[PDB]
Design a protein around this nucleic acid. Sequence first.
RNA 1: CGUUGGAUUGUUCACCCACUAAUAGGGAACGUGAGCUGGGUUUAGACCGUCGUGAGACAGGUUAGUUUUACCCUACUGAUG
RNA 2: GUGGCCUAUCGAUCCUUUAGUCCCUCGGAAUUUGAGGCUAGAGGUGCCAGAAAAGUUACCACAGGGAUAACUGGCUUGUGG
RNA 3: AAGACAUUGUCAGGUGGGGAGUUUGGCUGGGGCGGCACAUCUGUUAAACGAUAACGCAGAUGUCCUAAGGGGGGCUCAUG
RNA 4: UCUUAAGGUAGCCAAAUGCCUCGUCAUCUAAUUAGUGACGCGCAUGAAUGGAUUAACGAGAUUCCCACUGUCCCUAUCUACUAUCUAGCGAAACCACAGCCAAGGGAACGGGCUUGGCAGAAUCAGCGGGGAAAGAAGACCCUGUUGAGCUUGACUCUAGUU
RNA 5: CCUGAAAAUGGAUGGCGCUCAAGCGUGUUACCUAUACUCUACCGUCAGGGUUGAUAUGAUGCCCUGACGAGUAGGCAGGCGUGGAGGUCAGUGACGAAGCCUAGACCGUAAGGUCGGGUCGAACGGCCUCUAGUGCAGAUCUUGGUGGUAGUAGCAAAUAUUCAAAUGAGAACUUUGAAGACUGAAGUGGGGAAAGGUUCCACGUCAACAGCAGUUGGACGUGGGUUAGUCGAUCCUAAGAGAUGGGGAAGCUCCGUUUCAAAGGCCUGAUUUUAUGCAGGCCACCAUCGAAAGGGAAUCCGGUUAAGAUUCCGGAACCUGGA
RNA 6: AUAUGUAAGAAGUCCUUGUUACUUAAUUGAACGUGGACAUUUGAAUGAAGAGCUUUUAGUGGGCCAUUUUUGGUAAGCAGAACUGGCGAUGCGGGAUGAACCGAACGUAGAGUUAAGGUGCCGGAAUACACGCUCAUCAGACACCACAAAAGGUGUUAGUU
RNA 7: CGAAUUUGGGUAUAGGGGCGAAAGACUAAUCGAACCAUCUAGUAGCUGGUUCCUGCCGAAGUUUCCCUCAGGAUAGCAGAA
RNA 8: AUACUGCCAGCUGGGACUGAGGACUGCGACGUAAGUCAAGGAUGCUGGCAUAAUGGUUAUAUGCCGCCCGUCUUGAAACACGGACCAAGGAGUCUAACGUCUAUGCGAGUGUUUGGGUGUAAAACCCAUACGCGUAAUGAAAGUGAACGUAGGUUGGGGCCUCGCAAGAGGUGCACAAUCGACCGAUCCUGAUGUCUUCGGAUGGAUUUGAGUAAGAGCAUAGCUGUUGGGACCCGAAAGAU
RNA 9: UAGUAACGGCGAGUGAAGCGGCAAAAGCUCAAAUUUGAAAUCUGGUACCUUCGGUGCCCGAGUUGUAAUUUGGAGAGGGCAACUUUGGGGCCGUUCCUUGUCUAUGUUCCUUGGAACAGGACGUCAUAGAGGGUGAGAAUCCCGUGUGGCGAGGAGUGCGGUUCUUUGUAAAGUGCCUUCGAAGAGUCGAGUUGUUUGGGAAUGCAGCUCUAAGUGGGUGGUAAAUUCCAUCUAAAGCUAAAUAUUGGCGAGAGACCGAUAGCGAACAAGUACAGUGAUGGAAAGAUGAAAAGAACUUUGAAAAGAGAGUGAAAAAGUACGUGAAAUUGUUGAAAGGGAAGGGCAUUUGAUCAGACAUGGUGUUUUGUAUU
Lengths: 193, 148
Amino acid sequence: AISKNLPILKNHFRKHWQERVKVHFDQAGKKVSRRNARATRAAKIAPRPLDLLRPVVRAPTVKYNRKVRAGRGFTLAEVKAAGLTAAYARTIGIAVDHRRQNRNQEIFDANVQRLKEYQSKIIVFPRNGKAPEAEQVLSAAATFPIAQPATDVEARAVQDNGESAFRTLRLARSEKKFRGIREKRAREKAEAE
Amino acid sequence: PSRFTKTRKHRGHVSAGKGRIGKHRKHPGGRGMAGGQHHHRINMDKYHPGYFGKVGMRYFHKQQAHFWKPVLNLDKLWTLIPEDKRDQYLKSASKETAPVIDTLAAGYGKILGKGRIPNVPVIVKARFVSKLAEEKIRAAGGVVELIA
RNA sequence: CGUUGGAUUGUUCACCCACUAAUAGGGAACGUGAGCUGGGUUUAGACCGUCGUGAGACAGGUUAGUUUUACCCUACUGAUG
RNA sequence: GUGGCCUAUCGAUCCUUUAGUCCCUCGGAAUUUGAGGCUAGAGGUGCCAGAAAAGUUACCACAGGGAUAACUGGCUUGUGG
RNA sequence: AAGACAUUGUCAGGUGGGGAGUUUGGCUGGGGCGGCACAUCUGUUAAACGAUAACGCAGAUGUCCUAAGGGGGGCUCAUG
RNA sequence: UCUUAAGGUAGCCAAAUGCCUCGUCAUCUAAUUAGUGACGCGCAUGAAUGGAUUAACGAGAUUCCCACUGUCCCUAUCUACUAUCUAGCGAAACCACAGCCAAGGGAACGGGCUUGGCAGAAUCAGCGGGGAAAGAAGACCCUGUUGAGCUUGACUCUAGUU
RNA sequence: CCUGAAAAUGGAUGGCGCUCAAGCGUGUUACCUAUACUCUACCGUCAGGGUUGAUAUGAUGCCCUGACGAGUAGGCAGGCGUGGAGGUCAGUGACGAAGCCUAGACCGUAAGGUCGGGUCGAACGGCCUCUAGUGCAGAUCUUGGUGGUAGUAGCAAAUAUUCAAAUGAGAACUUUGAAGACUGAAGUGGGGAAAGGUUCCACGUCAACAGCAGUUGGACGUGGGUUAGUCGAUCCUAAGAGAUGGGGAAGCUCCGUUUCAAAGGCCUGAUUUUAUGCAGGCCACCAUCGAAAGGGAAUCCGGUUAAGAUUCCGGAACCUGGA
RNA sequence: AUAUGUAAGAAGUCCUUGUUACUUAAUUGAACGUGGACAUUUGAAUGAAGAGCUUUUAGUGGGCCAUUUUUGGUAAGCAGAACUGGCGAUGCGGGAUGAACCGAACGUAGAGUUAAGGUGCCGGAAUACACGCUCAUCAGACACCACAAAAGGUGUUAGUU
RNA sequence: CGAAUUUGGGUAUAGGGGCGAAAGACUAAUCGAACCAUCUAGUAGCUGGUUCCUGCCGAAGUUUCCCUCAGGAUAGCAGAA
RNA sequence: AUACUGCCAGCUGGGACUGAGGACUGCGACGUAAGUCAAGGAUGCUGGCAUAAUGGUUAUAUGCCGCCCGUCUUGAAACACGGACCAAGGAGUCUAACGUCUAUGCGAGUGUUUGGGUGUAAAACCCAUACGCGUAAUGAAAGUGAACGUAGGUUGGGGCCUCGCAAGAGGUGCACAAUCGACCGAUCCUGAUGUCUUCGGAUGGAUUUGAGUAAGAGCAUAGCUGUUGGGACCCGAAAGAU
RNA sequence: UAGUAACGGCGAGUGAAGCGGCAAAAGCUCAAAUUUGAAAUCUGGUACCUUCGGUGCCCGAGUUGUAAUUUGGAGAGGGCAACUUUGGGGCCGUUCCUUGUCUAUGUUCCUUGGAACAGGACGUCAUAGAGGGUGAGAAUCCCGUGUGGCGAGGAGUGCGGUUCUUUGUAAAGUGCCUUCGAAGAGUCGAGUUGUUUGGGAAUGCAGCUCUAAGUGGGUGGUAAAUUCCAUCUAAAGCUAAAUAUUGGCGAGAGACCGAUAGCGAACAAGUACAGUGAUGGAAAGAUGAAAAGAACUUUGAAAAGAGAGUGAAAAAGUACGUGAAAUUGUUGAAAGGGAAGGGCAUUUGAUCAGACAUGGUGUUUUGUAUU
């Protein structure tokens, strides 16, 4: 029923929720299993860095616009500018993403620099050599970290010219709001002589 | 701590604190929000006015990322500077050497003028700003420039 | 100290025929169903009249319709001790 | 003088509909139509703080109720005597 | 024989207690029938503040009015 | 003439249908709310929702007569088997504690309480006054925002069919 | 005071009883006794305070106090017990743990704790904390066990048993004689069907069972027993059930049974430089299941067993299939 | 009559004033003030086993019974309402007995005194004291309460012309 | 009591179905909708029960609304902090 | 003179119950002296026994009391219901999301434990860019978005400061309460320089309105109690479905 | 994200997704192209061999299309200037197990006891003091445990070296493009109906009707020409890991339960028994260290009893660990005139605990650090 001054709570428990209860007792055991799987795959691929090299990309929306993070793979344009074919990049451990485009020069340079750094920092064993192992590292991500680009200096000179940056916002919003009506007026005035 | 409950103290008393006349029954008033217009209307009108009906207009597929715009006030504006350089910036209150505050990397979307920053000039980079905040920054001698 | 026998009615009341000394009125969980009976009422079957579109209704009328147990304690009646 | 000399003569949510700014939104920019919002009325709940609603059961069922009827008993004694 | 009509598929309108699911108010000197004491108003009950019950008593309401609203002026009504 | 189409015809009746009602008359009896025969403004008879009649039939309902008789006046006696006592064998229902009354008061009908009466081990056979005895969470009645069977001009649908 | 003044079990100024009362009206006075009042002791609660001292005191520690104390529903607080858990008592214990019995003792207002004495046999407890499937008188509670009733109701339908002997520890009930009876040929006789399943038959005695008994038994233990060409099944079709071909259905499956289907089997030639290959013939039931009473190939007598016989044996026949 | 509103002060009582867009014909008013005068009585009584509450939550939401006012009803141990007090929820002493009446409310004990009710015996306590009345062939005997009336009687007792 | 007869076996009809010379009869002691398992520990404003001690405090049956009248919300009364 | 009232800080007796406290303290009295005492709670003397004598327990007897518990109920001993008996079992639980309060940690921040590292292999122990909540509100929404002042004035305020030999005066006044304002949002208005001449909306306001500002208080964990959904304190339908 | 946007008699209730952090990460291939100077492809039959197969030959399939080539990220009759690789059946071995085996230390003395595994003394090993067994609580008695060593087999491009050697015209990129660039139809899409979703002038799905197009088509969460956008490329297909796992097999645990509990079942438990059937479905653990399970004698017809005997115990006798209560029998003790039980108080009878060894004095020696 309903009673004294209390919040209205919506506890969605009118189905047979007790059949669908997943209490994670296996958290510790699953962490152990995940570490064991990582170690076993490392032993399997013993010279290899246990993961692929990912590119730096920008987060999509306006809320995460500021952040730069790790994407899925490098653009075909990026691997071309680095100087590799897509298939060879995949074979020597560079993640390649075909569907991602670079409309951005800054991100293009950042990822080309990442590719050059990876090429310099890795050694490809020959197919018929002595396999000079080099104390495998386990994380391309940890050895090629994503760093947020520095946008500005800590101190600068005040450049004031008298628009207050609020009148600017108000006016830009106004032009966006009224552009269609203004185009209407212009077209009507051109049409009616 | 089952041993600190009143169930432990009700052992031996017949009704378990629920009364002899009006006993502990299953759902004597209904289940959940039952009868909020009929017999729980008094509780609804006293403690949750505005509960029934609809007022505004809908928004199909509303994403809160569009409306992300945390607000930063002027009194907290100077906390965005590291504490080490904050004293130097406060003491050397000069133009042409003003510190740059990029509130977007700080995590804020709009700047509001809650008042009383010092008279140290400062370059403030903000997506949005309020009129009073811009006026107070100008009075302090700095500038707010719009970013995206 | 008595206050009956009957015709009709399931009847209580009635109402007649008689006898009689008289056929007074009542109570006892409207005494008394592990005392009886079961005519009536009062389940289920069925008919009729009126009512209801109907299913059905009707202290309206008809007909057929399982009446269980004491060996215990008291009380009582007798019987030992 | 903010209806009737005073004390009665009346109506939520949701929905619809009208009036008002022609003000906000249709979320990739919009001619424009359409639709959705903001404020005030109207369409009504008379069980009037507002469910959307025909019976029958003598074939009946369950949860209960001596909170409540049909005996006795109890108070009363109008009525009867 | 029959023939692009029957048939069959889909949608649409009838019909459809044959069947399905539901429902069939409350108060109440038991319930039912009656009434409304269910939203209200006047007088009394009501016991000289206010409040105060009963299916208490005597009634009334769901309307009516462009004047039967508002202002001003003039006049005075029933009856003998 | 009016409602609403027609106004109950033939018949039948206090009828298994008539409340008033134990209708009124006759008969049957010593006496008849019974029976039969009549009479019908018949609450509310009546024509295949069949009316009237009807031989035969009926573990159908009802009245009277003869016969017969323990139904009864008004009880008595006899037989078998029980009950009964013994050997063996041996349950159950019930059970708050129990078991003598009168009155009082009390949830208004007490085994207990109050005031009286009283009051003597252990018991057997009967008995049906009491234990408001036992048997069953009253089947009547009401309530429940509990059902179900059935019906329909209820609400909402539906298979079929068109 | 009397009349008015009548209700049912016997009967209540509470009873006995009381008459210048132990009645009625009134008036001093004495006396009786509530958990009330006064005053003391003690318990607890609340409150207002005191208290920093060189050791011998974990400061709501010690202490001064004044007032107060009913209680259902209900709230809160301090505690008492139970099973497990972390610490500790270098805790108790086969020289006796835990349990259990004990009108023995002490402590606490109590929940309860501690101990003495019996029984015994392998674990258990105090303290600070943690935890909960943590405390029962009831729920016509659950499951077990047990009563009074109670050596009671009862063991009374189907006519009925009696004498002797044997066996036996033991005989109303077993066996054998003798008598009396009963069913009375739509039987209490002799066989079978369904069903049962070894109960059939022989050999051994009280544990249970046979509502008494039991030496007996359809009980118990151990064994033995059912013989077919002819009797049945098997074969046939009945009402019907049901594959296939086909068609439905998401499908489990449903319909359909000869339907809009290309639906199979007995004689000589082939029967050895060559096989069942071939102008060798007739053709066209239109699966199958369904009867221990329907239809149907054929066995009788005598004898034999503890227990089987239309089955075994003896004799005498018949039917079916095979150059 | 009872019941009932308010007031009995320091937020109070009195002065060229200070503010204002309100108000006035008008520094006239209205409101709010600065600056000033009020003490051992700061403006009746009694009490105040602390005063202002803040949050949160239980049970309850069938009531019933007094003296009183009262409605319906012939009335009811009936039904329904009054400032109240009780029972529920509460034992104790008394009314023999009884939820509610009277007395009085409760920690465990001891002395004393009482309440209501009682003192012939049951039964603790005067068969006390004092004046009357009453004799019943259904006496009477103490509230709530467990009942009696109209009308009568040279029964007896006491009271005007 | 010679047939609308009685009966064995086989067979068909299965649960909102069957079957009924009709009684809501019969359908495995089950019938006004069988039995079995499951949904299901169905819901119950209704009945019953609800387990240790002591200490302190200590009620309400009233207000308003409610298909509200055996229930609830709300205010009041009470506890604790 | 006696009554009868009243007073005596007037005298003389006869009984009963109690004896709390326990290292000097006080107030008093006694010819006003060292001392004594009946003055802030009993001592002195004496006897018997030293045991079941006192007392405890237990059974009985006696006097007076005492109805059967639980339950629903205005009211139960009830001629209301359950209960013949005994043993064992037997009924407010856990979870998700929360309200008040309280303890703790940190605090304009807070939360390690989704993960990663490590480990004495579910424990430790160590590691944030994120995310949640908080730090901004308001409006349906476009949007706008919190100092005219010592973060305001007034009344009251604990505490602190200055105080004379015991009054009480002054000052400063946090929390908190009452009030008048100021600021932000919404609504209704009046609308300045300018101008994509229809836009932007300065300025001034309004018996209007908000879960706001006005020198942050929250976040997390735990505990009692309360809430809702869940079998939901335990047992209980008539039914309904597959 | 988020109990949010939305849905909902907008009531009760319901209710996702993008982003963000992380775990895991992996990519791709058919149809649509003429190899046309050579169906270059493949099943099968029959032979040979190194047989999860490989080679002669033969038939067949197949041109109504089997190979190579390309898959939208792209890709397709050629030519330059330095330009990695190959690939294939074995053997020693990286790697998981049926797994096997070996590897320490007291059973030394005394006490109690039936038993020492308990108490005491002395020891020893310990990368082993986990657990279990053994006649009681055992690191050291046994099995094991800890640490290492040595082996009875199987699976074999996550690979270092051998192994016969390259089928000596074997398959892959740009600094310049001569042309292009085939891309899935009763399918998108539209309507309508039903269902479903948070999806709201309709989210997905399905039935019916209509039914396309090539800068086309889908989407862009409010129904309808567009000056422009943005973003993918459907109606064909494959693909480990992180994820799930009340079943099966193996293993390790628990602040769980402890025989009315825990699964219904600790046991000849889905058993016995109940139903025609679907189905329903219990009860039931413990002698002792060891049967040493009671020889023998006596009474009895016998069961059995009484002795005796084994045993630590028979107060463990198979009806067996102690055997509680209800309920009984016997003995003992008490009361009892239509209940019993209870409270206060005493009495009587039973029964019983509380200084008299002592922080103080002192003495005629009980049995002569003092009694």
